[PDB]
Amino acid sequence: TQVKHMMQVIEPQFQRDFISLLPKELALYVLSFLEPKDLLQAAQTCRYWRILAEDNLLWREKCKEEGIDEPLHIKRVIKPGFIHSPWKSAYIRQHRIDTNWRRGELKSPKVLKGHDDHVITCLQFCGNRIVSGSDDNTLKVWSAVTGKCLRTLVGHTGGVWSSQMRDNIIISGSTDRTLKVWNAETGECIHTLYGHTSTVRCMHLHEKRVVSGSRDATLRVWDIETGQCLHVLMGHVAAVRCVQYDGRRVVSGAYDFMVKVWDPETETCLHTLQGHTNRVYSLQFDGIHVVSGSLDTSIRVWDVETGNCIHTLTGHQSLTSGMELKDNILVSGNADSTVKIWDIKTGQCLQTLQGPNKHQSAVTCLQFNKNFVITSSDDGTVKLWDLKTGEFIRNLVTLESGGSGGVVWRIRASNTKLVCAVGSRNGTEETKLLVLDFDVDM
């Protein structure tokens, strides 16, 4: 069906070619051995071929290859009708988006002025909502779509140094020692969580619970709905800088060079991972491996079940600020201005992002997917790299004040857009968010 409809209605008729003469099914079994790039050329051969190559189940699978899962349903009328395949257009859409990030003209970004003369300390990007956190004591909910400020969460009496968001629920951690739970739509504080005595430095939200790390050397697990404190994890002698929570175990990294694995329900420390010869600053956890980055220059990969160190990843030369772990592929941003990609299964350093177009200073943040790695730096640039080859592609953002104070503190990316928190310590750059759009016209 659908392919038959086309044949009856269009009536191509009379083809002296091998595939036009084959029974429909076998022609399709043949075209299935081709790759999207081929199918697209084949489709420009003739009307018979175009109708065939435009199957649908053929593309539904080619999409299940690039991990698409969702077909695209466009709308509206030329004559000789054509029954376009939603899966096929979904594929082309993505192909165009990738190309757009890669070499498509850079459309000037929406500028979102805010947090004047202050720092944007934490960033969240969920759907069409952007949430900026600042040491100016506030947070601002924005529309990635219009670039307008929807709300300003005023309430904290200290600077905000951490946040988390899960559609309409925002959480904040301030120097005032409390977390606050907000309603992103109405912008009203729903809870104020007391218990920490020192700065709420880091937090990780999982479903209805959020775990907070503080300078007071402890962590607390809170219920987002009933603003209560379910558990207190005490055992760290120095400040807790980073934390991860998957709902089962809580993993924490502290200035005491230690990484601790916990079972929150019974407030017990199941493991104390020892190895880092200096402050632990970054953490990633996938339910199986714990990964920690230290001021000691190394990155350790641990088995969460046994507490055993599986790999000690060496090569960076300074502080690893951020790391992202997906499918056992790790990407680390470092103050040494370098970025590395690792296979945490084998320990191999797959790529080091550097070269003539490398960062001129510390890497402040990064994002990646199956194709690219996006990196930001104090050099005022946000760069795009090829994950598979480790090669530099282009500078997505290049602050003119880059070499004299302009800085990109952090970034967040979705499939179609990039949100950059930008500013400076010396006023050469007004603090703002830059929103770049890579969506395609379809």
Binding site: D135, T199, R215
Partner: peptide
């Protein structure tokens, strides 16, 4: 190491 943190 002048990547953000709050003082005391």
């Amino acid at each position: 190491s002048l990547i953000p943190t709050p003082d005391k």
